[PDB]
Design an enzyme around this catalytic site. Structure first.
Site, PDB file in Angstrom:
ATOM      1  CB  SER A   1      -0.976  -0.007   1.176  1.00 44.76           C
ATOM      2  OG  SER A   1      -1.990  -0.972   0.954  1.00 44.76           O
TER       3      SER A   1
ATOM      4  CE  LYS B   1      -3.354   1.644  -0.848  1.00 47.16           C
ATOM      5  NZ  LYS B   1      -4.746   1.505  -0.359  1.00 47.16           N
TER       6      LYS B   1
ATOM      7  CE1 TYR C   1      -6.783  -0.170   3.140  1.00 47.09           C
ATOM      8  CE2 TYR C   1      -6.058   1.768   1.924  1.00 47.09           C
ATOM      9  CZ  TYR C   1      -5.961   0.406   2.194  1.00 47.09           C
ATOM     10  OH  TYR C   1      -5.082  -0.399   1.498  1.00 47.09           O
TER      11      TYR C   1
ATOM     12  CD  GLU D   1      -3.549   6.984   6.517  1.00 45.20           C
ATOM     13  OE1 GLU D   1      -3.378   6.785   7.742  1.00 45.20           O
ATOM     14  OE2 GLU D   1      -4.204   6.208   5.791  1.00 45.20           O
TER      15      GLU D   1
ATOM     16  CE  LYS E   1      -1.130   4.496   2.660  1.00 41.79           C
ATOM     17  NZ  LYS E   1      -1.177   3.248   3.485  1.00 41.79           N
ATOM     18  CB  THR E   2       1.466   0.897   7.247  1.00 41.85           C
ATOM     19  OG1 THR E   2       2.087  -0.287   7.747  1.00 41.85           O
ATOM     20  CG2 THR E   2      -0.004   0.643   6.938  1.00 41.85           C
ATOM     21  N   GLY E   3       2.448  -0.451   4.425  1.00 38.91           N
ATOM     22  CA  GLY E   3       2.058  -1.179   3.236  1.00 38.91           C
ATOM     23  C   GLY E   3       2.397  -2.649   3.275  1.00 38.91           C
ATOM     24  CB  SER E   4       1.084  -5.555   3.879  1.00 38.56           C
ATOM     25  OG  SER E   4       1.484  -4.951   5.096  1.00 38.56           O
TER      26      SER E   4
HETATM   27  C1  LIG Z   1      -1.791  -2.260   1.496  1.00 32.96           C
HETATM   28  O1  LIG Z   1      -0.858  -2.615   2.191  1.00 32.96           O
HETATM   29  C2  LIG Z   1      -2.928  -3.166   1.188  1.00 32.96           C
HETATM   30  C3  LIG Z   1      -3.519  -3.025  -0.103  1.00 32.96           C
HETATM   31  C4  LIG Z   1      -3.587  -4.085  -1.261  1.00 32.96           C
HETATM   32  C5  LIG Z   1      -3.693  -3.836   2.310  1.00 32.96           C
HETATM   33  N1  LIG Z   1      -5.091  -4.067   1.954  1.00 32.96           N
HETATM   34  C6  LIG Z   1      -5.352  -5.396   1.908  1.00 32.96           C
HETATM   35  C7  LIG Z   1      -6.601  -5.813   1.261  1.00 32.96           C
HETATM   36  O2  LIG Z   1      -7.211  -4.962   0.565  1.00 32.96           O
HETATM   37  O3  LIG Z   1      -6.999  -7.044   1.430  1.00 32.96           O
HETATM   38  C8  LIG Z   1      -4.127  -6.164   1.933  1.00 32.96           C
HETATM   39  C9  LIG Z   1      -3.234  -5.249   2.747  1.00 32.96           C
HETATM   40  C10 LIG Z   1      -1.789  -5.689   2.572  1.00 32.96           C
HETATM   41  C11 LIG Z   1      -1.682  -7.201   2.458  1.00 32.96           C
HETATM   42  C12 LIG Z   1      -2.318  -7.670   1.183  1.00 32.96           C
HETATM   43  C13 LIG Z   1      -3.819  -7.457   1.210  1.00 32.96           C
HETATM   44  O4  LIG Z   1      -4.420  -8.561   1.955  1.00 32.96           O
HETATM   45  C14 LIG Z   1      -4.994  -9.584   1.132  1.00 32.96           C
HETATM   46  C15 LIG Z   1      -4.507 -10.940   1.590  1.00 32.96           C
HETATM   47  C16 LIG Z   1      -3.345 -11.451   0.790  1.00 32.96           C
HETATM   48  C17 LIG Z   1      -2.199 -11.365   1.615  1.00 32.96           C
END
Ligand SMILES: *C(=O)[C@H](CC)[C@H]1NC(C(=O)O)=C2[C@H]1CCC[C@H]2OCCCC
Length: 359
Positions: A63, A66, A149, A271, A314-317
């Site tokens: 994320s 973004k 979000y 943010e 901002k955190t992201g995964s």
């Molecule tokens: C940002 O870090 C994201 C956006 C893709 C986060 N939102 C969700 C989601 O919308 O389900 C994530 C999460 C990060 C991890 C991936 C996603 O989770 C789905 C499960 C697969 C790991």
């Protein structure tokens, strides 16, 4: 002034314990302090092949992509190709459903459109299905009243932000953002000759990597190493030092405050919380229950320009990675934490808050 030694220990004695407790195979950190970034690398990028994490190691940002979408959007605004106040419909005339009317590019960029879902559904594989999806969407709330979000909101904003330019998202980002900032090891698609640097993600003992989906380049598709990312944080932390004029403004616009949501402020991708802020309020605002909930908003009209004393983050995964970035403009300090395991966000901000608090 904290010496380079003390800082090295401070990062060391924070990240290792963090990697043990969360069993993270690998992570790379920087550490923007006194004009220069400082790199620290730990563990593995690929357990199977025993390659340690290096400052060249590519990580999935998730994320955090973004933030690039946010700045690229502000850039288009700076050039005048787009305006936050324009109806979303102005760049997608096909979107004829009457429910889109009072919805703005601003609402899309800030998750304030009225309940767009966290994700663009998987049945959405092409342009015709993207259209149908949005065309069929029925808002639960009026525009500009609720923050929910969503990747389907900001994903759309980024794809529409670049339409007037006539340039495809990937090309617009490399040309207007990546290249002027010398981020030559940041990519939406890793080129074959760099695959070697590409780290493998690690889900419960399983090696993994992100999959291709609609509006992905915009929401969760960007990969980089710790060096590029540190410079991306240095640029956003000190835009004065950014030569390109429109990009300089795009950066300020992304850090601008468009909505107040409790203790938080929503920018374009970024943010913010006013600084000083206690760790407890940043860590707890980080919890899923808060981060996923649709919360009532407060319009900052006119949008407040960048406020230096801000904890901007901002955190992201992705399925296999976990990354976090935070910076305080007023104090010219920032941190990049890239890890190849998606651990809990509250754990990321506590550790980040802890090392920065030391500076
Ligand atoms: C940002 O870090 C994201 C956006 C893709 C986060 N939102 C969700 C989601 O919308 O389900 C994530 C999460 C990060 C991890 C991936 C996603 O989770 C789905 C499960 C697969 C790991």
């Amino acid at each position: 002034p904290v010496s380079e030694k003390q800082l090295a220990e401070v990062v060391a004695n924070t990240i290792t314990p963090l990697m043990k407790a969360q069993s993270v195979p690998g992570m790379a950190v920087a550490v923007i302090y006194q004009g220069k970034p400082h790199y620290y690398t730990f563990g593995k990028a690929d357990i199977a092949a025993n390659k340690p994490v290096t400052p060249q190691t590519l990580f999935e940002l998730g994320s955090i992509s973004k933030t690039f979408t946010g700045v690229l959007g502000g850039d288009a605004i700076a050039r005048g190709e787009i305006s936050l106040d324009d109806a979303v419909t102005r760049y997608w005339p096909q979107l004829t459903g009457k429910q889109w009317q009072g919805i703005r590019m601003l609402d899309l960029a800030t998750y304030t459109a009225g309940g767009l879902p966290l994700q663009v559904p998987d049945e959405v594989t092409d342009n015709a299905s993207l259209l149908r999806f949005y065309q069929n969407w029925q808002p639960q709330w009026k525009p500009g009243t609720t923050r929910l979000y969503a990747n389907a909101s900001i994903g759309l904003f980024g794809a529409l932000a670049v339409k007037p330019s006539g340039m495809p998202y990937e090309q617009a980002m490399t040309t207007r953002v990546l290249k002027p900032l010398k981020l030559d090891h940041t990519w939406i698609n890793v080129p074959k000759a760099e695959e070697a640097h590409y780290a493998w993600g690690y889900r419960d003992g399983k090696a993994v990597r992100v999959s291709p989906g609609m509006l992905d380049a915009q929401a969760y598709g960007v990969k980089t190493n710790v060096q590029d990312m540190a410079n991306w944080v240095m640029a956003n932390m000190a835009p004065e030092n950014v030569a390109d004029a429109s990009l300089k403004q795009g950066i300020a616009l992304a850090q601008s405050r468009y909505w107040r949501i409790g203790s938080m402020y929503q920018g374009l991708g970024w943010e913010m919380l006013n600084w000083p802020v206690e760790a407890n309020t940043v860590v707890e605002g980080s919890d899923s229950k808060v981060a996923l909930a649709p919360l009532p908003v407060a319009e900052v009209n006119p949008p407040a320009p960048p406020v230096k004393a801000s904890w901007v983050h901002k955190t992201g995964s992705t399925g296999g990675f976990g990354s976090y970035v935070a910076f305080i403009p007023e104090k010219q300090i920032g941190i990049v934490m890239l890890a190849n395991t998606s651990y809990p966000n509250p754990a990321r901000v506590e550790a980040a808050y802890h090392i920065l608090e030391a500076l």
